[PDB]
Scaffold this motif. Structure first.
Motif, mmCIF file in Angstrom:
data_model
loop_
_atom_site.group_PDB
_atom_site.id
_atom_site.type_symbol
_atom_site.label_atom_id
_atom_site.label_comp_id
_atom_site.label_asym_id
_atom_site.label_seq_id
_atom_site.Cartn_x
_atom_site.Cartn_y
_atom_site.Cartn_z
ATOM 1 N N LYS A 24 0.846 -1.210 0.000
ATOM 2 C CA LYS A 24 0.000 0.000 0.000
ATOM 3 C C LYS A 24 0.873 1.247 0.000
ATOM 4 C CE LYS A 24 -3.620 2.049 3.106
ATOM 5 N NZ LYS A 24 -4.249 1.741 4.403
ATOM 6 N N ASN A 25 0.463 2.309 -0.692
ATOM 7 C CA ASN A 25 1.076 3.650 -0.541
ATOM 8 C C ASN A 25 0.568 4.244 0.754
ATOM 9 O OD1 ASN A 25 0.516 6.873 -2.019
ATOM 10 N ND2 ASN A 25 2.446 6.171 -1.117
ATOM 11 N N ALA A 26 1.391 4.187 1.790
ATOM 12 C CA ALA A 26 0.903 4.685 3.088
ATOM 13 C C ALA A 26 2.084 5.142 3.933
ATOM 14 C CB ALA A 26 0.156 3.583 3.801
ATOM 15 N N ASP A 27 1.818 6.129 4.777
ATOM 16 C CA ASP A 27 2.806 6.623 5.762
ATOM 17 C C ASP A 27 2.770 5.563 6.871
ATOM 18 O OD1 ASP A 27 3.685 7.815 8.144
ATOM 19 O OD2 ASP A 27 2.932 9.812 7.614
ATOM 20 N N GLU A 34 -0.138 4.412 9.450
ATOM 21 C CA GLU A 34 -0.724 3.090 9.345
ATOM 22 C C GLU A 34 -0.663 2.345 10.676
ATOM 23 O OE1 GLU A 34 -2.419 2.161 6.650
ATOM 24 O OE2 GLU A 34 -2.428 0.003 6.925
ATOM 25 N N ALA A 35 0.495 2.411 11.342
ATOM 26 C CA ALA A 35 0.642 1.770 12.663
ATOM 27 C C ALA A 35 -0.361 2.367 13.666
ATOM 28 C CB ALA A 35 2.097 1.881 13.137
ATOM 29 N N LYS A 36 -0.420 3.682 13.684
ATOM 30 C CA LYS A 36 -1.354 4.397 14.606
ATOM 31 C C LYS A 36 -2.797 3.936 14.393
ATOM 32 C CE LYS A 36 0.095 8.723 14.284
ATOM 33 N NZ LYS A 36 0.304 10.156 14.606
ATOM 34 N N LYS A 37 -3.187 3.690 13.157
ATOM 35 C CA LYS A 37 -4.585 3.290 12.815
ATOM 36 C C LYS A 37 -4.819 1.817 13.157
ATOM 37 N N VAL A 38 -3.945 0.909 12.725
ATOM 38 C CA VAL A 38 -4.136 -0.546 12.834
ATOM 39 C C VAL A 38 -3.760 -1.056 14.223
ATOM 40 C CG1 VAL A 38 -3.368 -2.702 11.836
ATOM 41 C CG2 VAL A 38 -3.842 -0.724 10.360
ATOM 42 N N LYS A 39 -2.694 -0.522 14.845
ATOM 43 C CA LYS A 39 -2.108 -1.090 16.077
ATOM 44 C C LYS A 39 -1.792 -2.551 15.849
ATOM 45 C CE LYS A 39 -2.052 1.749 19.711
ATOM 46 N NZ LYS A 39 -1.906 0.735 20.781
ATOM 47 N N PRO A 40 -0.955 -2.856 14.838
ATOM 48 C CA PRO A 40 -0.642 -4.235 14.513
ATOM 49 C C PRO A 40 0.092 -4.900 15.685
ATOM 50 C CG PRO A 40 0.934 -2.775 13.493
ATOM 51 C CD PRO A 40 -0.164 -1.909 14.047
ATOM 52 N N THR A 41 0.071 -6.211 15.711
ATOM 53 C CA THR A 41 0.867 -6.991 16.668
ATOM 54 C C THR A 41 2.355 -6.641 16.503
ATOM 55 O OG1 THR A 41 -0.786 -8.720 16.541
ATOM 56 C CG2 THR A 41 1.355 -9.299 17.499
ATOM 57 N N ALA A 53 13.216 4.625 10.944
ATOM 58 C CA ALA A 53 13.572 4.612 12.382
ATOM 59 C C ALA A 53 13.331 5.984 13.024
ATOM 60 C CB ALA A 53 14.996 4.157 12.552
ATOM 61 N N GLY A 54 13.822 7.056 12.398
ATOM 62 C CA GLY A 54 13.626 8.410 12.947
ATOM 63 C C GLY A 54 12.163 8.806 13.048
ATOM 64 N N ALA A 55 11.376 8.480 12.023
ATOM 65 C CA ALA A 55 9.938 8.820 11.976
ATOM 66 C C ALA A 55 9.175 8.017 13.036
ATOM 67 C CB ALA A 55 9.420 8.551 10.586
ATOM 68 N N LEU A 56 9.407 6.705 13.101
ATOM 69 C CA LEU A 56 8.690 5.899 14.127
ATOM 70 C C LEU A 56 9.113 6.401 15.514
ATOM 71 C CD1 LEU A 56 9.027 2.256 12.721
ATOM 72 C CD2 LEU A 56 6.968 3.671 12.716
ATOM 73 N N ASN A 57 10.417 6.606 15.718
ATOM 74 C CA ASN A 57 10.867 7.032 17.055
ATOM 75 C C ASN A 57 10.202 8.368 17.433
ATOM 76 O OD1 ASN A 57 12.505 7.087 19.504
ATOM 77 N ND2 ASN A 57 13.482 8.831 18.446
ATOM 78 N N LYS A 58 10.130 9.309 16.496
ATOM 79 C CA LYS A 58 9.493 10.608 16.755
ATOM 80 C C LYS A 58 8.045 10.375 17.193
ATOM 81 C CE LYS A 58 8.456 15.029 14.417
ATOM 82 N NZ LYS A 58 8.549 15.714 13.094
ATOM 83 N N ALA A 59 7.346 9.464 16.543
ATOM 84 C CA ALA A 59 5.932 9.185 16.864
ATOM 85 C C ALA A 59 5.781 8.617 18.273
ATOM 86 C CB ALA A 59 5.331 8.291 15.800
ATOM 87 N N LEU A 79 3.179 -4.339 3.428
ATOM 88 C CA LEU A 79 4.263 -3.380 3.140
ATOM 89 C C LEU A 79 3.655 -2.012 2.959
ATOM 90 C CD1 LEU A 79 6.210 -5.531 0.574
ATOM 91 C CD2 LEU A 79 7.004 -4.961 2.859
ATOM 92 N N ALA A 80 4.328 -1.034 3.567
ATOM 93 C CA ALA A 80 3.952 0.394 3.460
ATOM 94 C C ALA A 80 5.005 1.146 2.631
ATOM 95 C CB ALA A 80 3.818 0.986 4.843
ATOM 96 N N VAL A 81 4.570 1.836 1.568
ATOM 97 C CA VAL A 81 5.479 2.636 0.689
ATOM 98 C C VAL A 81 5.058 4.111 0.758
ATOM 99 C CG1 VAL A 81 6.413 2.961 -1.632
ATOM 100 C CG2 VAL A 81 5.958 0.657 -0.822
ATOM 101 N N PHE A 82 5.895 4.942 1.392
ATOM 102 C CA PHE A 82 5.698 6.403 1.592
ATOM 103 C C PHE A 82 5.546 7.116 0.241
ATOM 104 C CE2 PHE A 82 5.816 9.843 4.503
ATOM 105 C CZ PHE A 82 6.748 10.803 4.202
ATOM 106 N N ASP A 83 6.509 6.909 -0.667
ATOM 107 C CA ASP A 83 6.577 7.584 -1.995
ATOM 108 C C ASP A 83 5.536 7.041 -2.978
ATOM 109 O OD1 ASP A 83 8.919 9.536 -3.335
ATOM 110 O OD2 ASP A 83 7.746 8.384 -4.780
#
Ligand SMILES: Nc1nc2c(Cl)cccc2s1
Length: 167
Positions: free
Chosen positions: A17-20, A24-31, A48-54, A151-155
């Protein structure tokens, strides 16, 4: 059945999916959410930097304690830590960084870590600032991972190229 929405099915077990990935993690709360980690778990930029910031830097605090106890990961290796506010768990996986001269054959070893988890939300390993060809990373993923990977693709541009070129 699972919570993942809007993905294109590439194979029996791989979805894209084309997704940030942070959103996506914030919405789904995957295992399991996969981080594009380095061996020092220094989450400065990239996935890593983006997830850590979140996580408000809680991922980095936990990671620093992990390294102080265990020392660095291996290129191709992984560790399971908390998912904080994003997921139950974060699987920190170290793909080879081409911009450091690491062996791209280690990308298959990196993806083998995913097989220890039945379902994962993940980025393409070694893509982005790790310098590998994302088309190659997607091929290794499909040919290595047997568990169910989202899989999540930002671009958006890259997403469309990955789908159009997929064999
Ligand atoms: N919020 C997000 N930041 C990123 C970065 Cl920096 C790289 C790849 C994917 C994502 S999603």
């Amino acid at each position: 059945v699972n919570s993942f929405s809007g993905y294109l099915k590439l194979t029996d077990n791989v979805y894209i999916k084309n997704a940030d990935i942070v959103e996506e993690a914030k919405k789904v709360k995957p295992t399991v959410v996969v981080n594009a980690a380095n061996v020092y778990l220094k989450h400065g930029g990239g996935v890593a930097g983006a997830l850590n910031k979140a996580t408000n830097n809680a991922m980095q605090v936990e990671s620093d304690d992990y390294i102080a106890t265990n020392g660095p990961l291996k290129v191709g290796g992984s560790c399971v830590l908390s998912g904080h506010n994003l997921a139950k768990h974060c699987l920190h996986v170290v793909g080879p960084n081409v911009n450091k001269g690491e062996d791209i054959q280690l990308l298959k070893s990196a993806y083998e870590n995913f097989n220890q988890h039945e379902v994962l939300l993940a980025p393409l390993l070694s893509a982005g600032i790790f310098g590998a060809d994302p088309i190659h990373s997607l091929r290794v993923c499909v040919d290595t991972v047997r568990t169910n990977v989202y899989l999540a693709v930002f671009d958006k541009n890259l997403y469309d190229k990955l789908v159009s070129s997929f064999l």
